[PDB]
Amino acid sequence: DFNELPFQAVKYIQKIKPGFKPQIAFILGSGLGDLVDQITNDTTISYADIPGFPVSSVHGHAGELVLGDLCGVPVMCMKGRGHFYEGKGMSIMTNPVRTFKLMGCEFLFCTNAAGSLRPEVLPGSVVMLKDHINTMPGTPLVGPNDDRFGPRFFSLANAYDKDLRADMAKIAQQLDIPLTEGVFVSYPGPCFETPAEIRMMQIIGGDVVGMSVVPEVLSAAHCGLKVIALTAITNLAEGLSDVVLSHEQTLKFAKVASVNFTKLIEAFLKSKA
Amino acid sequence: DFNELPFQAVKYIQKIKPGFKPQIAFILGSGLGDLVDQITNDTTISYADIPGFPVSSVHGHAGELVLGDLCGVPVMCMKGRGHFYEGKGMSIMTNPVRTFKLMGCEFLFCTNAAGSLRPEVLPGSVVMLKDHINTMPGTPLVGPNDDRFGPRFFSLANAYDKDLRADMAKIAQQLDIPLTEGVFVSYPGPCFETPAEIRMMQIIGGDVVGMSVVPEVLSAAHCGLKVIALTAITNLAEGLSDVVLSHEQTLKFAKVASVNFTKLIEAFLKSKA
Amino acid sequence: DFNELPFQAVKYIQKIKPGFKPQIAFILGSGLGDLVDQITNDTTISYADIPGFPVSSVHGHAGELVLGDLCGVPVMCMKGRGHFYEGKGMSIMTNPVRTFKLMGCEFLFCTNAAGSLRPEVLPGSVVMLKDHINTMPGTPLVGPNDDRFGPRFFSLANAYDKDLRADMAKIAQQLDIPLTEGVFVSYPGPCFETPAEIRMMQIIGGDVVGMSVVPEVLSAAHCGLKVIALTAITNLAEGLSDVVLSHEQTLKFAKVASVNFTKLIEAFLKSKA
Ligand SMILES: O=c1[nH]c(=O)c2nc[nH]c2[nH]1
Ligand SMILES: O=c1[nH]c(=O)c2nc[nH]c2[nH]1
Numbered sequence: 133d134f135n136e137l138p139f140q141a142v143k144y145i146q147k148i149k150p151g152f153k154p155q156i157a158f159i160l161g162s163g164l165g166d167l168v169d170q171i172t173n174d175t176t177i178s179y180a181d182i183p184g185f186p187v188s189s190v191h192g193h194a195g196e197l198v199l200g201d202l203c204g205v206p207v208m209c210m211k212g213r214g215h216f217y218e219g220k221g222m223s224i225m226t227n228p229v230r231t232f233k234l235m236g237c238e239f240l241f242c243t244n245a246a247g248s249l250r251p252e253v254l255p256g257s258v259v260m261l262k263d264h265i266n267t268m269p270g271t272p273l274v275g276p277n278d279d280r281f282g283p284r285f286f287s288l289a290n291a292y293d294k295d296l297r298a299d300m301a302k303i304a305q306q307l308d309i310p311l312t313e314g315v316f317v318s319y320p321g322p323c324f325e326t327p328a329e330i331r332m333m334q335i336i337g338g339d340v341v342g343m344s345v346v347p348e349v350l351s352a353a354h355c356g357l358k359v360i361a362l363t364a365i366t367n368l369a370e371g372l373s374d375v376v377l378s379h380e381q382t383l384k385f386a387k388v389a390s391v392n393f394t395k396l397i398e399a400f401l402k403s404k405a
Numbered sequence: 406d407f408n409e410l411p412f413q414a415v416k417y418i419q420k421i422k423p424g425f426k427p428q429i430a431f432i433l434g435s436g437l438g439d440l441v442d443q444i445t446n447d448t449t450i451s452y453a454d455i456p457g458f459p460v461s462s463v464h465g466h467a468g469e470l471v472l473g474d475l476c477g478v479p480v481m482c483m484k485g486r487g488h489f490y491e492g493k494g495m496s497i498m499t500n501p502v503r504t505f506k507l508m509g510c511e512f513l514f515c516t517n518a519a520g521s522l523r524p525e526v527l528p529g530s531v532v533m534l535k536d537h538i539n540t541m542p543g544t545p546l547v548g549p550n551d552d553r554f555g556p557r558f559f560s561l562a563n564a565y566d567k568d569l570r571a572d573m574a575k576i577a578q579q580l581d582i583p584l585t586e587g588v589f590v591s592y593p594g595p596c597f598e599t600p601a602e603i604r605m606m607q608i609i610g611g612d613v614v615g616m617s618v619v620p621e622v623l624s625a626a627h628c629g630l631k632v633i634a635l636t637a638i639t640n641l642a643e644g645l646s647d648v649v650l651s652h653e654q655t656l657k658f659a660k661v662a663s664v665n666f667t668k669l670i671e672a673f674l675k676s677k678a
Numbered sequence: 679d680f681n682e683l684p685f686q687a688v689k690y691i692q693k694i695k696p697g698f699k700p701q702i703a704f705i706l707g708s709g710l711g712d713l714v715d716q717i718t719n720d721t722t723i724s725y726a727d728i729p730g731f732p733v734s735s736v737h738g739h740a741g742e743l744v745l746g747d748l749c750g751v752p753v754m755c756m757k758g759r760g761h762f763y764e765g766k767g768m769s770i771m772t773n774p775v776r777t778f779k780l781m782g783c784e785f786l787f788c789t790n791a792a793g794s795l796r797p798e799v800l801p802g803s804v805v806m807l808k809d810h811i812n813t814m815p816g817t818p819l820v821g822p823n824d825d826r827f828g829p830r831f832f833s834l835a836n837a838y839d840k841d842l843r844a845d846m847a848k849i850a851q852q853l854d855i856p857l858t859e860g861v862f863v864s865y866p867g868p869c870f871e872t873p874a875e876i877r878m879m880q881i882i883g884g885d886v887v888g889m890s891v892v893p894e895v896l897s898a899a900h901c902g903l904k905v906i907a908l909t910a911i912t913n914l915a916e917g918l919s920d921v922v923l924s925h926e927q928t929l930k931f932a933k934v935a936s937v938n939f940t941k942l943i944e945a946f947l948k949s950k951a
């Protein structure tokens with residue numbers, strides 16, 4: 133029955149907001165939740181009410197899907213995501229991503245907060261992801277394949293769509309907002325990484341490290357939903373500075389990064405309208 | 406009851422083909438399924454009918470065990486394997502390998518199709534595996550130990566038997582068929598690897614990358630079944646060429662590689678008869 | 679109900695030994711089990727009788743908790759641990775560690791036997807751990823967070839307490855016992871590592887490799903229990919010598935290492951009394 137959930141999600145969403153045809157899906161991580169306040173003609177749906185969507189174990193911290201118009205683009209925005217560290221496995225974002233796909237989104241704009249493995253890319257920066265290295269155990273597609281959504285095996289050669297990256301690089305350049313491209317390393321968490329793990333990630337070629345992104349990106353590649361993913365850098369990774377990592381610390385720099393992050397998103401959306 | 410399955414498999418196989426005493430076990434991966442057509446005095450058993458053997462989730466694509474004589478050697482050939490990405494865990498090949506052991510095979514000849522991490526080892530090549538690096542989560546032997554089959558802890562120093570490798574290297578040299586030796590890196594799949602993951606695998610010392618081999622090889626080391634393993638290279642690994650990876654692409658070069666792969670297997674078997 | 683087990687463990691332990699107020703917790707791995715013989719005013723409790731404590735699958739090899747006075751310090755010593763390879767997941771040491779915490783221990787002294795990734799650190803040596811790289815799948819804290827014990831996210835910057843390391847380095851220097859500091863790499867097991875895996879671990883910056891430590895250390899960091907961890911080197915890691923790895927081989931050098939290991943522990947305890 134897990135496999136049917138996106139079809140039920142679609143029927144539910146279509147009944148709540150008849151007529152609505154989203155063009156772009158968003159996943160809103162730390163610092164970017166507030167972007168939903170800018171959506172007009174909006175409808176908000178609790179994840180508790182949408183089949184297959186993640187429900188947090190923390191009382192009062194369940195996410196919401198916001199549907200509406202943003203900068204001339206019809207969007208469906210997940211305010212909140214599920215993570216591998218929640219204990220529901222790597223497939224925790226597969227049904228939501230398939231729901232974006234079936235709703236007709238042309239692509240997914242994934243956002244998250246994370247640490248920089250490069251000392252010269254500082255807290256408060258935004259980075260555009262160009263590839264990943266997965267260190268979470270397994271992948272979301274382990275298990276029987278649902279061929280309704282995609283093939284048993286699939287290439288990750290364009291997992292972070294090349295043309296969307298070129299589109300956004302042009303926007304950043306127009307805005308004079310620095311936007312490096314980096315390789316994302318996933319980590320299971322929910323502890324932050326040790327300093328030795330961070331040095332390992334540098335050795336194997338990582339630029340950014342975090343606890344999300346990979347599950348939803350792999351689920352998207354499987355069902356052929358294009359992805360662009362940008363990250364708010366909230367700290368240099370463990371061992372690279374003397375800052376104490378904590379969710380409070382994360383949220384501090386996520387707020388900072390959100391100022392330019394929002395300018396990039398708005399200009400990008402206006403360019404797609 | 407999972408632990409008893411090989412004893413039931415043996416009783417079943419012995420009833421279907423009384424008298425048969427296999428000398429060598431094979432696991433036949435992509436391109437090498439057709440080798441079963443060369444077996445004489447053959448009996449074929451659907452995996453569905455053998456306790457503990459893997460049954461695919463894909464309608465009509467269940468494997469078969471073929472018992473008979475090949476080039477003067479009594480063999481038992483698994484046409485098809487189970488993989489970690491099927492979602493039954495790392496132990497999906499443990500009962501079949503224990504079945505080879507209890508049936509009396511002197512060793513296991515493992516075959517698979519995979520990508521080359523070395524640009525100079527080209528698609529259509531055959532490589533002999535000499536060691537592995539496991540990146541799948543856990544190992545097949547996680548869980549209580551079945552001491553009927555092997556010890557709680559076990560060395561992997563000769564996981565790809567040294568003397569069998571020397572035997573096969575002599576065969577390849579006699580035949581003038583190039584046969585490099587390589588370190589195999591396992592990957593969970595069922596996505597292919599990203600280009601950054603491939604560079605990571607090069608950095609850590611890999612030569613070949615694929616989605617099988619390790620589970621059955623670790624299960625074999627535990628129960629003391631010797632292993633020789635050869636791989637058909639079906640592509641350079643992701644990012645090392647501009648080919649699009651897909652199962653169709655795999656099968657294309659598996660057919661090519663199978664020509665020399667079969668010559669090596671036949672000469673090797675004649676040398677053991 | 680898993681989450682309540684440490685509270686039940688505490689009530690049970692307090693009833694069996696009313697009044698007892700441990701200052702330091704120990705986990706006793708290979709070669710160091712015998713240290714419990716030196717505890718006075720001792721009480722011994724089978725793990726079978728303590729809620730949440732690990733019970734081995736091997737008949738007759740269940741561990742025991744020993745409570746008493748050692749070198750002027752009230753201690754609670756786990757003689758035996760649970761491991762990831764037992765198949766109960768990464769959380770197999772979480773309840774025992776939380777039990778140490780609730781009992782009031784000021785820190786945990788973790789001990790284990792393991793392989794050296796450095797050829798110049800020889801079998802029979804003792805190493806003090808300063809950091810780790812986890813290669814086991816996931817972490818003990820994957821799943822809903824029990825905020826009674828610690829936060830959803832947590833830093834590993836001081837996972838091997840810096841001041842305890844300085845304390846012990848002074849002891850080793852006073853005793854003229856060599857004590858290098860090393861990065862520990864965890865491995866799922868229960869196979870030992872391949873030679874290629876060992877070279878990978880050297881490449882990524884490891885100094886010592888073993889099948890425990892990480893689960894209990896991460897559980898301790900989550901609930902804020904300070905850790906000092908020392909390792910008995912029982913072999914150079916696979917491929918670095920011609921010794922055959924086996925539990926028998928491990929136990930051989932664990933006995934050797936235990937002589938200086940015990941001197942270090944005794945002097946360290948006297949310094950804390
Ligand atoms: O895994 C992570 N590592 C970090 O450094 C970080 N910062 C924010 N979020 C993060 N996640
Ligand atoms: O994991 C894999 N990587 C590849 O490049 C490949 N080619 C065939 N089969 C393969 N499996």
Ligand SMILES: O=c1[nH]c(=O)c2nc[nH]c2[nH]1
Binds near residue numbers: 888912916
């Ligand atoms: O994973 C391990 N690797 C080893 O070399 C070793 N020696 C003792 N115990 C060990 N565990």
Ligand SMILES: [Cl-]
Binds near residue numbers: 162244
């Ligand atoms: Cl985030």
Ligand SMILES: [Cl-]
Binds near residue numbers: 434
């Ligand atoms: Cl194959």
Ligand SMILES: [Cl-]
Binds near residue numbers: 791
């Ligand atoms: Cl130990």
